[PDB]
């Protein structure tokens, strides 16, 4: 599923990301835009053999288990397949654990490069929430 900008903003708000651990809603919408372009089925194979899965491109080396990644930690205790659903529940649950580390949203490279330091609120403006 490819979410519309406002559609995802509303969904993430329902999923409790409006002000989760100091991060405003716009951060999450912006992150999704640049990490997966709002595509829940997005996957990207990395050099180290790991793969980034879903709307928030969660990595198989540290966060989810896809059974094909060397040195897997599975910090989110969840199969990577669960992060490729049109239902964002699992991706949000895992993203919350990731951001609860001291590194915060810096875990998301696209967010760090295209969102951090910008007017992230702009990503939720002009939306019926």
């Amino acid at each position, epitope marked *: 599923k490819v979410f519309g900008r406002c559609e995802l903003a509303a969904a993430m*708000k*329902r*999923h*409790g*990301l*409006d*002000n*989760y*651990r*100091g991060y405003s809603l716009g951060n999450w919408v912006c992150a999704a835009k640049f990490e997966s372009n709002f595509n829940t089925q997005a996957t990207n194979r990395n050099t180290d053999g790991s793969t980034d899965y879903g709307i928030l491109q969660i990595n198989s080396r*540290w966060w989810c288990n896809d059974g094909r990644t060397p040195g897997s*930690r*599975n*910090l989110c*205790n969840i199969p990577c397949s669960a992060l490729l659903s049109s239902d964002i*529940t699992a991706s949000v*649950n895992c993203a*919350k*654990k990731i951001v*609860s*580390d*001291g*590194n915060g949203m810096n875990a998301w490279v696209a967010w760090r490069n295209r969102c951090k330091g910008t007017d992230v609120q702009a990503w939720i403006r002009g939306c019926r929430l």
Partner: antibody
Amino acid sequence: DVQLQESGPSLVKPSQTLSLTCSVTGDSITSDYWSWIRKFPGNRLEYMGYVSYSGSTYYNPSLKSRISITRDTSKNQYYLDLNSVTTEDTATYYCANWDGDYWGQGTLVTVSA
Amino acid sequence: DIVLTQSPATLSVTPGNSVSLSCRASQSIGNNLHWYQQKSHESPRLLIKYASQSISGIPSRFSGSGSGTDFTLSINSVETEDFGMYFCQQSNAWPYTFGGGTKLEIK
């Protein structure tokens, strides 16, 4: 499967440092975030803090920075140090993973002269 | 900090009947409210996560509802094994905080 268990002295004196150990069996401590929670005499629960995968820690401001949570991969266990305890620190201490799925049995520590 | 207020403090019920426990947050916490059950001489047990999400291994009679500042834990047809303490906990802001608890006992 995973198992957690607290260990350490059950009786300590005021002003000393209270130290507890949580032994993890079933998986490496490097694969999760680890926490400490305590229950006071009147069914009052307090989340003390947790240490995440990067080594970063989050401590409850209520502890006034008297707390330290550390890990030891080689022994697959993590710890809780609480400095200058008082009778207000008497409580049942529990270790559990961040998700809340795995908890230790809990251990009562009494602070008394 | 976020203050969680639970009510009633105590609730007596006859096995077979249903009940609902309340947990109110001083400030909005989204859906970041979790429910725990605790029996004497026992460690807390997670029943519901993120307000309404089910937990594998927990009886289906437990369900959670709510968002923002108002949350409820419901038990459809209370069983003897359900008597004990129930606590809500929020994870939207640090420090994580717990409600004062609701004691469920046989009437």
